[PDB]
């Protein structure tokens with residue numbers, strides 16, 4: 001399971017997350033050319049690796065769509081992380097330590113969301 | 120950071136987390152020997168370095184107990200995940216999604232964690 005994106009994978013998903021339509025290799029390459037000089041095959045290859053990581057889907061003139069949005073990807077990584085805990089006791093303790101390590105704004109965002117979740 | 124441990128440091132911490140009682144250098148060495156051929160001094164030395172990092176405590180038989188439990192590794196993995204967010208806006212939206220994604224038992228665990236933080 002992916003736990004972080006490399007800088008080129010991130011450049012890539014950043015373009016994809018900025019467009020509603022699935023994008024061709026050529027379109028991603030043109031976006032990345034703003035800061036990098038890359039081979040077309042390098043952009044192609046990174047798309048394919050991101051597809052193998054289920055972060056994009058190849059649509060068929062091949063186009064690529066992000067499987068998760070920017071925010072939902074982060075949320076999913078957090079879920080994947082909590083899933084590492086061995087049992088409900090350590091999930092509980094993990095969550096205690098987790099909220100100690102986020103900011104207040106973050107802790108409150110959690111509080112607000114939880115209160116909406118139920119009521 | 121538990122999430123940033125070297126591979127041998129992690130192998131040791133894994134063993135210690137797997138056992139209720141503090142473990143001798145011999146016990147750690149025997150446990151690691153299933154997957155590696157290491158010198159006794161190598162294990163002893165990594166325990167010493169972990170101790171200087173405050174990740175284990177030597178208990179006087181000389182034995183070693185983990186200072187932080189594996190639930191703190193899980194919390195760290197969550198912190199690292201949240202850190203993948205590109206800015207505060209995305210950071211807050213990901214937490215909302217997280218709360219939306221978790222099970223009810225986890226939400227309730229989260230509620231308990233935030234109450235403790237609150238106290």
Ligand SMILES: [Cl-]
Pocket residue numbers: 037038039042
């Ligand atoms: Cl290249």
Ligand SMILES: [Cl-]
Pocket residue numbers: 084085086087090091189190193
């Ligand atoms: Cl755990």
Ligand SMILES: [Cl-]
Pocket residue numbers: 156157158161
């Ligand atoms: Cl060795």
